[PDB]
Design a protein around this ligand. Sequence first.
Ligand SMILES: Nc1ncnc2c1ncn2[C@@H]1O[C@@H]2COP(=O)(O)O[C@H]2[C@H]1O
Lengths: 80, 159, 1041, 71, 159, 76
Amino acid sequence: ILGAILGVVASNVPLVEEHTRDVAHMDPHVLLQIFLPVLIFESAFAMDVHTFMRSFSQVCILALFGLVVASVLTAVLAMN
Amino acid sequence: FLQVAVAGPLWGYAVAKVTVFFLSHIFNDALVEITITLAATYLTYYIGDIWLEVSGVLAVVVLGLIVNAEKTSISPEVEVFLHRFWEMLAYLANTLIFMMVGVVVTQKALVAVDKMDWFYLIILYLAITIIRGMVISLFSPILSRIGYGLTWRNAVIMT
Amino acid sequence: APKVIVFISGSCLFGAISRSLFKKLPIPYTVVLLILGAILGVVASNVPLVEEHTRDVAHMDPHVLLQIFLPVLIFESAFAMDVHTFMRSFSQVCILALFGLVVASVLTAVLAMNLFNYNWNFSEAMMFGAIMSATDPVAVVALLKDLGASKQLGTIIEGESLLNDGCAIVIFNVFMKMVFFPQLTSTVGQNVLYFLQVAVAGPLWGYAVAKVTVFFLSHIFNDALVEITITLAATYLTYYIGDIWLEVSGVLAVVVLGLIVNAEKTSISPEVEVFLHRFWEMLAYLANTLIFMMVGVVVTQKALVAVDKMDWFYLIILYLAITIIRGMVISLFSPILSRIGYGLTWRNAVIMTWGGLRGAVGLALALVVENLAGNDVIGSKFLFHTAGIVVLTLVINATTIQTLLRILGMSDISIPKRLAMAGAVRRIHEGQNRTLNMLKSDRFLADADWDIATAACEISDPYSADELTLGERKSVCPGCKAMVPNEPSPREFADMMEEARLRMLKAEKISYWKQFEHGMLAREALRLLVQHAEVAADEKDQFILVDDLKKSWQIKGIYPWLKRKLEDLISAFEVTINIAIVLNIVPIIMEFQKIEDALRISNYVFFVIYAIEAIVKILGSHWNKFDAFILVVALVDVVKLFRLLRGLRMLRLTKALIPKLILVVNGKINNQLSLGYDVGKGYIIGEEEVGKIIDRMVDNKKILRELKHISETGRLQVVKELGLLQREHPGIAVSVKTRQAIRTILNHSRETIHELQGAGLLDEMEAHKLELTVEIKMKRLMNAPSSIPPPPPENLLKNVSWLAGDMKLIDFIKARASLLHFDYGEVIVREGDESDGLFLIVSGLVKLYGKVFEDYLTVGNVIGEMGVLTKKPRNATVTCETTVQVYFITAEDMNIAIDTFTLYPSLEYRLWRVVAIRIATPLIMEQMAFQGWTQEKVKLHLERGYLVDLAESHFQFNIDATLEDVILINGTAYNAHTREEIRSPCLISRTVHKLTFQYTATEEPRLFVVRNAEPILDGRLDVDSKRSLISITEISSNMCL
Amino acid sequence: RTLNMLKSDRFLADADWDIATAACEISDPYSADELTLGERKSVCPGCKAMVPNEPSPREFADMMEEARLRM
Amino acid sequence: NGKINNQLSLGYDVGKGYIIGEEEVGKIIDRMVDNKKILRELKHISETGRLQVVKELGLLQREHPGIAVSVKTRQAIRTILNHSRETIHELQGAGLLDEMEAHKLELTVEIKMKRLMNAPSSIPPPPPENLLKNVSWLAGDMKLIDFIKARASLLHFDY
Amino acid sequence: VILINGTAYNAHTREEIRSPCLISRTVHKLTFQYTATEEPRLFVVRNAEPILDGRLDVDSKRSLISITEISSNMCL
Ligand SMILES: Nc1ncnc2c1ncn2[C@@H]1O[C@@H]2COP(=O)(O)O[C@H]2[C@H]1O
């Protein structure tokens, strides 16, 4: 909500337009290469790995195959 | 497909073993261990995604799981520092992503939106919840016959 | 695809390799980082992919380099400082850093102009001197902290380095604006205004944002990441807004902000505090590694293409002249710097001269000069000379400063430190041998390879005229190792007196450390106490004097005068009119189109003339008299229209802002009085402990009597001084005593939480929840009212220990009390009068004097309890020192109250419990002194006990194994052996099987026992209305199957 | 116990103890079940219930289950 | 050998935890259990479980000798270093050692613990001559060690 | 106090210590007796016990200077 308020202020005011233009209109690859390693490494590092590996088969089959079939179903839903 | 789905985790495993071996032989300097962890994460993702043309996300997944598995190779003060440091780094990344997303949504994405698009958003939310529930319900006969089966309450909470 | 990630992560890997491989070598890792940067730069000059990466990173913008790397380095230099020792020598560090930096920059500019063949003018040479003068010693500070004493020299060096870096970047920015980026002319008044703006509004902006950051950090509970991001964003926003938006020196702002945040570390949670220390250290390490790698790459790519043998000769002469100039600066300011509280010797001057290590700050300034100069040769010469001076200073000064600290005699380990380390190593070796002998006979770990175990568990001694001094120190001790009877000599008596004084001072230091580690003392009070102890130990055969301790709680200064003046100044409607004041204020800022909407309709008709003057002050002082002056000036209601609002706003806001200044002054007096109270309590508890352990240490009776006499005179003087300090400022003393009481209760509750966690009775998550609760309570205690008003004398009767919960007894005692007012009467209690009632002190400080026991009791202490309970003539004469107000409950009323209220725990039982605790603390403290018990631990162990009801025992008592200590309070008792009934109150010897009390003339001798502390814990709940208040009632832990 | 110790201290004796007891007030975070607790309280006739008796086979089974739970 | 070392360390820790827990719960069972018949039954089943786990751990020692010797050496070094750290904290808290010197000794024992973390996981079993040298009732007396070693008799009982 | 193998008489000598067990803390004194040769061992653990004066000695090369006689039991 605060980002939306700052964005409409930047759409009105030119100095906030300068700041959010230089930052929010960023390159995609630099956005991935900066923000994805931090989030992915913290998600992997905050895990309790003993209880994760004790139920690794169930988590693996659920995440992998449920993600595949949910992506397929969402694609069919979007197309239809 | 073989290159991505195999050499992602293999590259992550290799750099994770190298990082664990490097962290095991460091004594009485915390900052070396913290910078080794940070540079190992960023170099793993960059070299995997760009130089080796492989899935760098699975490499960081495998590297983080192995480093969290071998927490005994890190000193305990460095261990609790690394926990709080990666927590605040993820907090920084989430805050920056949400602020940038709000700015670009109300600057660019909100100029082309109709009442049909809002209706599609509502039906998309309902169908996403229904699809996730159907996925968990269809995989529930498989997921029940493991060492930790799913009840209906756990399935509802996961949905 | 950003190559900056490759260069940053490669620089981190190279820094890790440099730190790991150069642990043992005396060469710093920054020099080999520069060498690796040069190798990477020539590889990039050959190979095009490394050229791509180092082109995208090392050829960076100057302003982004400053705005990224300078706040981190400056904030870590300010935050790693020990701010108490920095502010104790702030004048010397300030004059040395400021004036020595100015004169060294001037001398380096003159040297550059006269020596260098490049035709630099005075502004470019002053930029060169500003870059060269900035010193960043970290290895010197680490070596001075590691090598025992001269910690104050290390703090002087670190504070001078921080202020020198800040002022160097300030004068560098001034002369860089004079040379490169503008060339604009200005008048003398604009130059004066610019100098005033920079050198004043830098620290003022830093102070303002630091106060805002501290106020924001004080009100954050149970989220660390918010505090860490608040610190980081405050630092970066302070530097950016100061440097860019306000056009002010942002470096001094970050210096002031870091010093204030390091000063108020109590507003941060301790886990967040240690995280912030390690996090800012890591950030400064990252910034240093990146700066050194980038500097090496750009030096070997751009700065090394224009360099001659004359330039190398100029580099060598520049290094020699820089060292000579710094030595001349320290020598010329040595007469000024000697006459401070910490003067400089010649060895400290030599260490400070040779400790001028050039760091990453000057390298960053040379980088921004070289990028600002463009294709001109001045930036190349600047970068080459700065890199050469950095390399030479790092290598030569680091290695020869280790050698010079060895040579000058400042690195030798002191004899008591060597003794303590050797004793600790011997104790660790004995404990390891006992653990090894225990483990060799274990069930499981019995067939282990014990040669490898003894090789691995081999922690050794770190330390592996003096002979004559040790010979004297060994001939001064003819102790248990040498059983030769003799008689003392006057030279031998003087040596014994000196040795006894040294042992007393050493044991006082041990007591101060014991107070700190369990926690009664603060850090600064402990530092002051051990400083006074070592000062007394060093000089002139004197003990720790009362005057140097008295300098801590002398509250007088600017703050009590300000408090008195503001309290003389003073004597939701007000909130509403203050809201109206601010709502009028913001139109004045908007005023200073339709002529601004008719000047916002004449300021909303002067806000309907201040809401008809707040309905004429809701139909109503001298404050209101000048408010009526503002009223009639508003009745006059374009210079007058502009002036009236500005005169209205501050004059109306003065009444609001005065009590906030009162609260600020009360907070400053609260801090100073807290320090004074902590120093006084530490000295009193240390003197009590060292008096309880002085009979074992001191053998000669005359020296024992002299030491006991001087110790008890010092103790009585400090006790009387603290009582008068309580009498001086009542509300602030009540606030600091309330804060200390809440902190003590919360610390003991946290100890109970850790005890119940470690005993297994509570799991880890629930113990973590309770620890979160008590930590939130402690941090909310940190931000407390510092001027808590004193309780009424009626409320002091409610919160006594011998009547706390019995409301009917409270009503009876409060109804039949008598508040007397003695003024220097000294006729409270006489030596032999009959008992006529109690005396509950509600004000003032009494003085006890009787059999020779001397003490100064205060508010809360009851006088007359022994005489009233035992029906005997009183013990000691109690006098009045400052207008004591007692609560005289008469003897007949006390007898009626004892006979009346007995269905509860009886009033006689409560009074006997209070006097039993008071008479039983010094006996247990005398017996268990050598086992390592403090007075607070002894009192808390005594508080668990209960008086034995002798009706069931029928005057025959048996000592079981459950009872840990038995103390007879009032009278005699026989036993099974019945050798002699015990005449005096004392602790019962634990060998005695039974006690046989006798019926005599009516005393009924009370005995006090403390049973030792005692996993099923079955409890019963009950459901209530709304099905949310379901709670366990009958916790038993004593059930059947 | 800490409050009763601190009320009779040399220094911290005139503090405002109402504010101290208000601040040091760490409370309980948690503020068919009735029949289950009734069984769990009828299974414990312990030191708070001093009634001599003799065991029953249903009582013996309940005592065995309670002893196993306590172990 | 490292993987078997980790699994055998987990098994030894589980067995030692159960044995020490059964010893403690047998020492505190007289107060908790009032009926003598149930007390005797619980003591009997507790002692049978304790004896079975003790025999299983002895056979586990007999299975892999070098790996068991390595994990017992690691546990012994860790126990001695933990008690030395407790002695350091005791000497610090009693005031006899200042904060910087206690920090130096804590740094030394932490460096020793982290070097213990990277240890040979297949330490060979000591010879039977070396087991006579490191007993508790003859440790330092070299002449007594020589006398007992000269006049010993190594027997080879087989069931 | 734990008597390891044998008997001892009390100062009250109500009944001599029959079995190896924890000798009670209430007993003032023990009177071990000479009998058929066992010589009954009693095991005692004394409670643990700040001046700590020690003597060094300078050796060759003036680097191995170390304290030898840590005593903590001296006179003035
Ligand atoms: N050594 C002491 N310690 C604490 N309080 C004392 C001591 N001596 C006297 N008092 C107090 O001073 C009072 C003087 O008269 P009482 O003997 O009636 O009761 C006495 C106690 O309350």
